[PDB]
Design a protein around this nucleic acid. Structure first.
Ligand SMILES: Nc1nc2c(ncn2[C@H]2C[C@H](O)[C@@H](COP(=O)(O)NP(=O)(O)OP(=O)(O)O)O2)c(=O)[nH]1
Ligand SMILES: [Mn+2]
Ligand SMILES: [Mn+2]
Length: 430
DNA sequence: ATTATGACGCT
DNA sequence: AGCGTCAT
């Protein structure tokens, strides 16, 4: 009862850019704005593979992973922007630089955890305590939450999307106890006011729109963020969780989309996240291991303790390229040439990283995939990264992988390589 | 020929 | 250290 801690200590937000690479290209090229648009990598094979899709194009059924030729079948007026190519491969530098723009704005409001190229978590607990101090018990006006949805509201006792949003927000605000600076619902509401400000700052200073989730932990904030995309933010309160999870497919929760979520569904004979509540912590640990079991036991009650890590920069810097089918590398000259191309891109990114961020990588991880292997990596080998020199890095990568060539002939490579991947890791402050 | 990465758990 | 999982 009273000692039953409900994981409402923290205010956590997740901010995720809407169709991010598309917005980067639309900012650069106004002709693409407010159009069905997608971003593609490469062109020759089936028109290139789509990795980002404007919401106008999603209305026609265009999705990531679709070949552009097929997307064009669904949406003949679809506009396409191609990722830059450098040294024979896709080069994502434009999107990484845009990402840095956004992350630097978010960092003004709180310490962030960079979780991908286009999203970050924010622990707003302290900023909320400050804004509550300033408010002096003053209520929160709906005018301060102009793009906020309250998940699960309105309820009970209407035809337009914005009208529904405002109805739900009024029900939420009317029920708020603003004299209690420790009410979790009030704390989430103040967090949402701050996130409105953060999102306004991002759009004003970059031209990019984003969505956001506000809840008591990272998993709920991420899920909330997705609920009302694009260009809106969603507050998922602790109290909204039973209804939200009652019909929430297990796979929708981050980390349960793969084999583990399939095993939850199959072993327990359930479909929805809320059904997990009927099992004891020990039962879940017995099926899914001690860590997963404890995580599931708390998560189906809306509780998760994973902290917002103070980390604005990526932990690794890596370069990869596939060589599918008849393009797989089957000679020693080919392997050396592409290792050098990857290594030159890596050198460039690493030198820029060192100048910006006062750190140096110390370990180089070489990953390859060999033909006829379905796994992502067929083999991973690490070596020391002592100089930011592409020729040295590619020579060392070759040295650590060259024992994989089963060809007796010196010139040929067998079986051919369908993937090369260089990753710089283990950063030290320089 | 669902590509380019990046985080993280496991042993 | 090297592999597997989840991601998108
Ligand atoms: N190279 C590469 N980039 C990718 C891939 N998948 C995504 N990206 C890039 C392109 C994406 O723009 C970006 C961010 O990924 P999201 O947040 O998952 N999708 P978005 O922001 O587009 O739309 P939404 O409004 O639904 O959040 O990552 C991929 O498989 N490969
Ligand atoms: Mn996004
Ligand atoms: Mn994202």
């Amino acid at each position: 009862g009273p000692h039953m801690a409900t994981g409402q200590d923290r205010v956590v937000a997740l901010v995720d850019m809407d169709c991010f690479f598309v917005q980067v290209e639309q900012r650069q090229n106004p002709h693409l704005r407010n159009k069905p648009c997608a971003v593609v990598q490469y062109k020759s094979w089936k028109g290139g593979g789509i990795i980002a899709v404007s919401y106008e194009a999603r209305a026609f059924g265009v999705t990531r992973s679709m070949w552009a030729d097929d997307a064009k079948k669904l949406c003949p007026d679809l506009l396409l922007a191609q990722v830059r190519e450098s040294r024979g491969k896709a080069n994502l530098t434009k999107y990484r630089e845009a990402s840095v723009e956004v992350m630097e704005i978010m960092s003004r409001f709180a310490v962030i955890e960079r979780a991908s190229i286009d999203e970050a978590y924010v622990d707003l607990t302290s900023a909320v305590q400050e804004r509550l101090q300033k408010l002096q018990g003053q209520p929160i006006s709906a005018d301060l939450l102009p793009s906020t949805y309250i998940e699960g509201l309105p309820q009970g006792p209407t035809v337009q999307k914005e009208g529904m949003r405002k109805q739900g927000l009024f029900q939420w605000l009317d029920s708020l106890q603003i004299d209690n600076l420790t009410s979790p619902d009030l704390q989430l509401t103040v967090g949402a006011v701050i996130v409105e400000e953060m999102r306004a700052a991002i759009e004003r200073e970059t031209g990019f729109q984003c969505s956001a989730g506000i809840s008591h932990n990272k998993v709920l904030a991420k899920l909330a963020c997705g609920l009302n995309k694009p260009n809106r933010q969603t507050l998922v309160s602790h109290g909204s969780v039973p209804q939200l999870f009652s019909q929430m497919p297990i796979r929708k929760i981050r980390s349960l989309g793969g084999k583990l979520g399939a095993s939850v569904i199959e072993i327990l004979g359930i479909e929805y996240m809320g059904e997990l509540t009927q099992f004891t912590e020990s039962q879940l640990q017995s099926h899914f291991g001690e860590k997963n079991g404890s995580w599931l036991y708390a998560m189906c009650r809306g509780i998760e303790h994973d902290p917002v890590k103070p980390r604005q920069l990526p932990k690794t810097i890596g370069c990869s390229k596939n060589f599918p089918g008849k393009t797989a590398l089957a000679t020693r000259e080919q392997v050396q040439w592409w290792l050098l191309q990857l290594a030159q891109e890596l050198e460039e990114r690493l030198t820029k990283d060192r100048n910006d961020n006062d750190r140096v990588a110390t370990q180089l991880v070489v990953s390859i995939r060999v033909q006829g292997d379905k796994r992502l990596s067929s083999l991973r080998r690490c070596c020391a990264l002592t100089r930011y020199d592409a020729h040295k890095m590619s020579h060392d990568a070759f040295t650590v992988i060259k024992n994989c060539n089963t060809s007796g002939i010196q010139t040929e490579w067998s079986p051919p390589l369908t993937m090369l991947f260089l990753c710089a890791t283990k950063f030290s402050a320089s």
